[PDB]
Design a binder for this molecule. Structure first.
Ligand SMILES: NC(=O)C1=CN([C@@H]2O[C@H](COP(=O)(O)OP(=O)(O)OC[C@H]3O[C@@H](n4cnc5c(N)ncnc54)[C@H](O)[C@@H]3O)[C@@H](O)[C@H]2O)C=CC1
Ligand SMILES: [Mg+2]
Ligand SMILES: [Mg+2]
Ligand SMILES: [Mg+2]
Ligand SMILES: [Mg+2]
Ligand code: NA
Ligand code: NA
Ligand code: NA
Ligand code: NA
Lengths: 494, 494, 494, 494
């Protein structure tokens, strides 16, 4: 059951969060955040820039000083704090879910049952990790006692996208705080509202001032400021491949800070002939159309074996046509609008390119409403590897269906991409599943399912889809700095 | 390629091994070891008893004293020594392979290509573990520095069987020595020769005196003395369920030493209807008849789906009838003789039991030769769960084939046993494989294969098949004593 | 801020807990539980026996059946349930603390600020482990895919003592439940009340029926019934060394169930000459007298370097004389009564033994009150290793102070014991701390502190103090059954 | 006991190593390698460039293709190959030690007893890791089976310096090869000889063609080609901070390849007043002057407490003056020449700067010989934090001694640096050791010792000294790509 939402939730936070206090931009400037469903302005938000970032970094650094409350706090207590924050978010679940939908555009039902649930599960998972990421006692040669201390990396700059505002915030804060680090987060200008409210809950939870600092603003301004800052130890980024390069170069040009990236993808979703038709079709649909198709791991390349291609396509087109697009607050809506005008136009452009290049338009292909940024569920058939829609990340409700013959063939074609975030295999055969799951060059390989995220399992990309992993135990590596301590002893014994 | 064997290998070691030296039993008594292929005496061996065990324990304890060569030795050097031992074993591979066959009875080809190969791989695997079984630095609450030392458990008593003489010795010494322990090994009275020769290689390898001590003798005498010894810290045993109880009781009645056991089994080998016929038949045959059927993890309960039962049985019978039984030194021999007269009679007894209780004798069922302890590859059809040959470990070339209809049914029947050492599933279906591998209550579940042992993968039993695991990283747990050291520090910081 | 205690809480639970319901003993019999501070009967409690245990095991086994709610439940949810239980315990903190004091005798202040706090921290720690105890994917030889599943051991029999009623229950349930096992707990006949109330909270928390079953009763009856049960997979025990042997023998005589023990000790507390006098004195005092001296890890052997012996003794005697003994509910009380009459007489007997064998009685040595089981803080000086009070565990407010000269000397004397649960070292010197922490044969070695327990760090004994470890990651090992699954694949690749 | 060297070792390898074959540069160009002890040319070496690097990467990629001998090879076999390589290096130990001294300049005794020894220990350590870096089976939510595969990162570009020619090669190949990766190594132009010969041993060891490819040449040419290559998956670099920036920027500008760096340092060596004088003096000397002071972790900032400053300096000056500088082949030589003319002049420049800025020259300060690049062991006293020689990495036989009063003071001064590779603490006090080891912001903190390297313990820098760790288990992280596989199962059970 989903509690009825408030289609016009009030905004309580719209400024820069530093030292557990709300601040206006030093420039006093503000930027508008739009409701993609109506195209109307929700409210103004403080436009942070370099000077605001510097204030945030200094606060975080101060909070990270040896002997500070955050540093002296027991590891188990950091966990207690993460749990408390989770409880606070759950208490305000209905509000946050609605506010998320208002600013992002995704269906309210989805924000409540999926986004918010996963946010709670992520924070509670890492809460448990706070006092369990042990260091090591090493049996080094000679008369010595050698061991490693797993210390926090320090001031962590976290730049997140807009597709999953609350979840992205959770995926970043969870591991960072669990390991005792301090954060300076730059949320997307398109969806800053929800993140800012959570900061209020972070203060309420009892987190010391400066531990978490949020700076809303634009990328080239606030974002680049964090990436090039001389006092930021680590930077985590999730977004476009283009900016990924900028972040890495900025890090190498500044203080050589640690970097980890997650930069979209063109994930192949292979459907073998022996696959369960009904299931494969529904999952393939979900694989691509999920969250308005705005998922880095979306199945944007649906490979289907020739013997079942025709039927699969027929069913897929039917499922796409039946996909209800409309007001995200209406319980019957399956697909809301795209996040903004920029994306809206970009997707329409890709659709145009698909038609131009010879791909077969089977359904949709145009705007689905006069107001807002709605696009019809579009499906392209007989797509070839060389086509643009088959190589570039659309990030919209545009499905590409390709045909293939042999398993050896699909392996090469699926791996022939600079991306490698995820992939899937639908088959009933044990050997095929193992052959493909091993052969596919991707961070995550789903078998007979898709978009199955668990705070316990790591997520990250191969090749140009990024580096490093998020979630699970692996998610703690990037937020940990290893220190070896080798002490001379009188006489070492086993 | 297998080097032509010396069918009459000379015996160089036949005494008690203590402090790198050979000793006669204090009683000066000796016992004969027989060649199961001829029934003739190979030679006499020192019959160790309590007083001999005491000498061994004292030697081991002294070698384990703080500041001793074995205690001060670099962990990495322990690895170097294990690798050296393996090299020495490989140098003498052809000799050991023959001697193994002479005393045990298994085919020389198998002793060479399988037994010795696995011995080498085991020692080399664990050699690498010597300096990698790290302790931990814990983020304990308060102003403290807490860490754990992974220390050796101490003087380890190891009582091993006769089915895999050299292999059993390696599976025991490998983990024990890698972790810096000392050993007092009691080898089987039926197969003491090969183990003794290896002791010679242990001294040649450079191991300090007292690190490894071998005491050949009988169970109730030497074995019981180790199990009840007041200065033996841990005991590892592999053999009968009956003696398993005695060992654990002995441990609890003495100094409460740590115990780990491996007590045989009645492993189910499920063959689903969609399984590859030829493959399943060959593997099901190997699963049961391997090493004269003297494997604790033998597939002694071959469950076959009714739809393929008739064909499977027909093929299994043909394969059994074609199985060459004869002189283990002849390259054409697939099956040698049983280890001794005791087992020979026991198996014959079980065979008669099978006939008596209504099981259908399909082939074999009697003695395969005039001299030696050879038994015909026997196969029972239409076996029921309640039958004795379906519940008790035969440990001989006697195959039981049962029929079943549904997968839910076979799960309950397979798990309806006090044993739980291993199990197998032959199916092409993904879901079936995962369903069964999860449902089966066994230490090891092989899918579309059987008897696949890897030094990297743990092996052990569920229920009454034993406790604890051998091989892999897990094999080091039982040979490690954990010490927590909590130091008060001026001010604890993350 | 310690809330005003309910000097005599009302008893709500006093029966056998099975399938989340309260049952009388099959025999309808009941036994009295006494308030040690007055010697008066608090109330009657159902006297469980073999038949009651049988009902509990069947309930647990049923709850552990494949496909059951407890088995299908997400690992993360088991964590949610453990956290919920903790919150319910914190809600009823004030009540539990008082009830604990009423049944056990320990000071209410200590029950609240120490016992209950530790219980909460224990449950919350393990709650986080629920979904993080990963199995492994192994790079086994040949064309195979090998991995391990970390499954629950099954039905766990947990027999606990009376010194820390609530804490012992948490230390056992925390790891067991986090790993998905089922429990049949046999609490101490002396202190059954608090544990039984927690069972009510367990039901309220939402744990499925049969997951946790508590059977109050006597040792030779209910306790032995669990240890010898044919369907109990594992047994955890904490208590006397004598009973420890009985349990291990019972296990070996029955179904060969897995065993782990914690059997008291005679922990050495080494005070070097360069130690901080004031600190060492107060700590050595706490080390011995904590919880009426009823701690398995009590520093019952206080070794003091000759150069500071005299002063240390003077100060220690003064501190002992100032130790307030009286009504546990009075905020000024530092020491309450002993758990019962049996312990009361046993301690007085040991004190008389101390006098008889030549130990120098410095203070106390007799009964501290007319009613109840109160004993005066006793301190013996010039104690020799061979003395009874220096070898046997007193478990009372009786301090043993020994003198020594060299560091090499103290190591040997400290290690010359069949016990090895804990030890301590008080020194300002780096090398001395490292030398002793490595040389001492004990499960835990405290440096410049004592009785420092953290849910993060393992606790267990060496030699005859037990086997296996509790708390920390290690605490999960004994509650985990490892299953290896090796699957044949088309072609193995790195 | 060092075997008399061959002061004029013959050069057998001086070309580019690709697919186990020797190739001339495409341009046919060659560059001279100088003997720093004489200033004379040893021989010509193929000058690899972009086109040569391309051939190498293509070879490596080919060797990394799925189904290749290197990919299909058992993980344990990779270990066998690493051990074989070590054995081959040990066989030619005397030759390589000499060749190392000839091209690098370090004393032959040190090359034999230290460099080569450490090379062997590194290779053999990692050989053991080959089949032990397990992935995980995760208890993810819902009806799924999730696990991770620890796969090789791919084609690894490794650019190494000249201070430890053979050791740097071992530190890079060991972990990369153990995890199944392929390598394209660019050795230093100053010291290419020894690495090239090892390549010949790599072939002899049995490693498949293309697994290891070495391209000798200049940095801006061959080195930059690798860092910017579109088909190189990961790059590991050790050298100057300046080039570290270039590498990371090249990576972000190219294919976003993974990067790990080790960029020198200015490691503080704190000597407390209570430290053992004689020991601290000798170690402080070794800490700085080791390998002609050409160590990234050199104790270039010797902080000494005022109360002992005078005596410490007096002793250090004496030890510096007695330090034998001369022909590295003479067994009495403690210090050889600097690697080349460029470093020679740079160091002299730094010495001149030290004098100019007010540092007190205590001894040395000039050229130590007519021919070759020998510098006198120089010691500067009364150095202040703001001085150039106190901030910049000299990388020569130039010691800086600073004075301090309090422990809190030295912490801030030691940490006031952009570097953070290593640090040391000399004290007899437990609390001071622990206070400092935790407070110091460095990758490695040595206590009462220095330059203690063990293949078991990780080494890496904090801040601008680099990112990532080498050696130990941690050394495998950067060479492993994590793949999550989540499979849908019929019904998930614990
Ligand atoms: N688990 C396994 O792999 C093996 C199981 N078995 C089973 O055991 C049955 C009988 O063969 P046995 O050799 O008699 O098994 P067993 O358990 O009696 O003998 C195995 C080892 O235990 C020692 N032992 C015997 N009595 C002992 C005692 N009182 N205290 C301490 N150690 C003692 C023996 O000397 C030998 O070293 C076989 O038919 C088969 O069912 C036999 C060999 C191996
Ligand atoms: Mg952009
Ligand atoms: Mg027997
Ligand atoms: Mg008793
Ligand atoms: Mg340069
Ligand atoms: Na917006
Ligand atoms: Na024999
Ligand atoms: Na009581
Ligand atoms: Na050179």
């Amino acid at each position: 059951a989903v509690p009825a939402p408030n289609q016009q939730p009030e905004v309580f936070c719209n400024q820069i969060f530093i030292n557990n206090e709300w601040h206006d931009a030093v420039s006093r400037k503000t930027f508008p955040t739009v409701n993609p469903s109506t195209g109307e302005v929700i409210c103004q938000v403080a436009e942070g820039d370099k000077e605001d970032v510097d204030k945030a970094v200094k606060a975080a650094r101060a909070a990270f000083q040896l002997g500070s409350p955050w540093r002296r706090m027991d590891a188990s207590h950091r966990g207690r704090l993460l749990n408390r924050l989770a409880d606070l978010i759950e208490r305000d679940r209905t509000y946050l879910a609605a506010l998320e939908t208002l600013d992002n555009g995704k269906p309210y039902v989805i924000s409540y049952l999926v986004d918010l649930d996963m946010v709670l599960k992520c924070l509670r998972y890492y809460a448990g990790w706070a006092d369990k990421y042990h260091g090591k006692t090493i049996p080094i040669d000679g008369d010595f006692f050698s061991y490693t201390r797993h210390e926090p990396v320090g001031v962590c700059g976290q730049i997140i996208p807009w597709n999953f505002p609350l979840l992205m915030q959770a995926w970043k804060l969870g591991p960072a705080l669990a390991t005792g680090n301090v954060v300076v987060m730059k949320v997307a200008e398109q969806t800053p509202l929800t993140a800012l409210y959570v900061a209020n809950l972070i203060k309420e939870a009892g987190f010391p001032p400066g531990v978490v600092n949020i700076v809303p603003g634009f990328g080239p301004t606030a974002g680049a400021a964090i990436a090039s800052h001389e006092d930021v130890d680590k930077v985590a980024f999730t977004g476009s491949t283009e900016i990924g390069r900028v972040i890495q170069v900025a890090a190498g040009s500044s203080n050589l800070k640690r970097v980890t990236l997650e930069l979209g993808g063109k994930s192949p979703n292979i459907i073998m002939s022996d696959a369960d038709m009904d299931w494969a079709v529904e999952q393939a649909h979900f694989a691509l159309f999920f969250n308005q198709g705005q998922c880095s791991c979306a199945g944007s390349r649906t490979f289907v074996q020739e013997d079942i291609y025709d039927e699969f396509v027929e069913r897929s087109v039917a499922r796409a046509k039946s996909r209800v697009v409309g007001n995200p607050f209406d319980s019957k809506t399956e697909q809301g609008p795209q996040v903004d005008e920029t994306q809206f136009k970009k997707i329409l452009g890709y659709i145009n390119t698909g038609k131009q290049e010879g791909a077969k338009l089977l359904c949709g292909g145009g705007i689905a409403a006069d107001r807002g940024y709605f696009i019809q569920p579009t499906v392209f058939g007989d797509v070839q590897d060389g086509m643009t829609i088959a190589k570039e990340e659309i990030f919209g409700p545009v499905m590409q269906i390709l045909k293939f013959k042999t398993i050896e063939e699909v392996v090469g074609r699926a791996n022939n991409s600079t991306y490698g975030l995820a992939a899937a295999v639908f088959t009933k055969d044990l050997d095929k599943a193992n052959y493909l799951s091993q052969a596919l060059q991707a961070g995550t390989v789903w078998v007979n399912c898709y978009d199955v995220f668990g705070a316990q399992s790591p997520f990250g990309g191969y090749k140009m889809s990024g580096s490093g992993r998020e979630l699970g135990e692996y998610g703690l590596q990037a937020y940990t700095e290893v220190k070896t301590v080798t002490v001379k002893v009188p006489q070492k014994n086993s």
